[PDB]
Amino acid sequence: GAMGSMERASLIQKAKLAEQAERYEDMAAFMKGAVEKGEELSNEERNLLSVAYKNVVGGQRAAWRVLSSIEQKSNEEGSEEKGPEVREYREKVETELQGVCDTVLGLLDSHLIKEAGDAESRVFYLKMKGDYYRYLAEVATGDDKKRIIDSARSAYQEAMDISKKEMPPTHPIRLGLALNFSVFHYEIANSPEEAISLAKTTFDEAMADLHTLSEDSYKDSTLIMQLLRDNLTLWT
């Protein structure tokens, strides 16, 4: 693509510089170029990829929600007609969001997932797949909303099944995946009980495994377990 002429290593290096510069769109494009080199990503690179897009899409999601709330307010009784702009601009932000999600999903489908044989990679990419369908679900309102949700669900489920089989319950990817899948349940699938059961069980199974960990692994896991607890506290 645009990054076709840059060395894979240089893209990765630049992705890391963009991350330092908080230039996440650039980071994302560098990482996309790196993915598109066709080589599997190392753990670090997969996290670079994830960080880049999460940040890009997180800005678009936060924007979309701002615009969505504005738009919902203009749709209330007594709201003064302001014309199409709010909807137009929400749609613009939404479209751009969908296109980032489509791009990530496209990187996962071509060909990250199919080449990812290790649990850490495969779960990670499936989680990412769940996450980006989830972001699509967040803005979905059409005939495809159920299928988008189902795709998020199916990706998360396959990631959960592998993570459960192949990773310790404290594995940060397993924990992050469960955290997000729990959020998917709560806020996308209208299954707050499942969301809560998932976060509870995940937290408790991780708790029971902490003893196996070095101090640094302990810190990685407990960091994520705390996010599970924050949700549980929020949700209960």
């Binding site: 955290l179 997000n180 959020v183 949700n231």
Partner: peptide, 6 residues
């Protein structure tokens, strides 16, 4: 306040 995802 916003639920966490990672």
């Amino acid at each position: 306040k916003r639920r966490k995802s990672v």
